[PDB]
Amino acid sequence: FAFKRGISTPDLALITRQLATLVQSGMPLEECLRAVAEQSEKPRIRTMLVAVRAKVTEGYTLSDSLGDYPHVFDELFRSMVAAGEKSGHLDSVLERLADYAENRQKMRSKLQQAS
Amino acid sequence: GISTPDLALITRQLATLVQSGMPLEECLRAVAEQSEKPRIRTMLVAVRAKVTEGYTLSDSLGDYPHVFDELFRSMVAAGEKSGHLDSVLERLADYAENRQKMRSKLQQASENLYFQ
Ligand SMILES: [Ca+2]
Ligand SMILES: [Ca+2]
Ligand SMILES: [Cl-]
Ligand code: NA
């Protein structure tokens, strides 16, 4: 039996926002992933993003690469990325995913605060 | 001015882009293009225009002292002068993120307890 957990809601919000911002600026996907990793304060997240990037540099899509961490990026997240990649809208779906992740962080906090 | 979350957003985005090695004017263009808030887009385009004309970022931000306070602009100035804008922006992003997180949690906790 194996078992791994995802990352915190703020941690997902930060990296999704950074990746969306970098991709939308017109930088190569691999270079965007390098920057998000290198700017991370979270060793596990840094390692994960180095591994996602490693797959991207072998030529795989972002969605397929995120596939190596299904415990972190769920099927829906990876489906949204794939939809963007297939339709030529990776930039605007990453924006959507960033907005989603930030809203998720906020609502999780709203639920739990003062408990 | 603008909200605590919106300052955190643009500061994180600008820090992220600058630390990637992208020229400052190009970074400012991207943050502008990506903004949902028309007022913020306007401000960033105006700041970008000034930077391309040779004004420093710190001097340009002084046109919006209601958004970028004396500490913020002072920090940027120190970074530009020293050739370390990249790391100063990172610290401003961390600071702004932290402020948003801690203030948002107080807001939510206050809402939750006060209205229960
Ligand atoms: Ca948005
Ligand atoms: Ca940091
Ligand atoms: Cl893991
Ligand atoms: Na799917």
Curated annotation (Swiss-Prot), chain A:
Reported function: Component of the type II secretion system inner membrane complex required for the energy-dependent secretion of extracellular factors such as proteases and toxins from the periplasm.
Cytoplasmic face of the membrane: 1-114
SUBUNIT field: Type II secretion system is composed of four main components: the outer membrane complex, the inner membrane complex, the cytoplasmic secretion ATPase and the periplasm-spanning pseudopilus. Homodimer. Interacts with EpsE/GspE and EpsL/GspL components.
Protein name: Type II secretion system protein F
Binding-site list for Ca(2+): 41, 95, 99
Gene for this chain: epsF
Organism per entry: Vibrio cholerae serotype O1 (strain ATCC 39315 / El Tor Inaba N16961)
Residues of the whole record sequence present: 57 to 170 of 406
Family: Belongs to the GSP F family.
Compartments, record wording: Cell inner membrane
